[PDB]
Q: What sequence folds into this?
RNA sequence: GCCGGGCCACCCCUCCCACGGCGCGACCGCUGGGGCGGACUGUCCAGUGCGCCCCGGGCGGGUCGCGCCGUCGGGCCCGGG
């Protein structure tokens, strides 16, 4: 059979609904305000 | 000294181009709010970007058009009396 029909036929391309499965990289302001929130929370607990 | 032409000087009108200034309009990026979908953060319920739409405003520069101002401006110092 291989010697008879050796050609390869590609699988047809399929439509995509464009769903991301990973996590996008966090942004500069996002991480800066995360650090700010952490500092505020720690100081709040220290006062409390 | 012998007869004509043209030009700039009078006085007035009008074209184009160049330069500088002022004001208006069209296209741009950057920046404060609202609506939507979601993703994330914080040892108080609070907050942060993201993609779309609405954007009411600001910013100046790059180009274009418009109007005015100024030039012992340039067009044989355009042309008309």
A:
């Amino acid at each position: 059979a291989i010697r008879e029909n050796p050609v390869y036929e590609k699988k047809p391309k399929r439509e995509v609904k464009k769903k991301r499965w990973n996590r996008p990289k966090m942004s500069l302001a996002q991480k800066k305000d995360r650090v700010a929130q952490k500092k505020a929370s720690f100081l709040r607990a220290q006062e409390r």
Q: What stands out?
A: The CA atoms of residues 9 and 43 of chain A lie 65 Å apart. Chain A is about 40% helix and 0% strand. Helices of chain A lie at 28-47. The two ends of chain A are 80 Å apart (CA to CA).
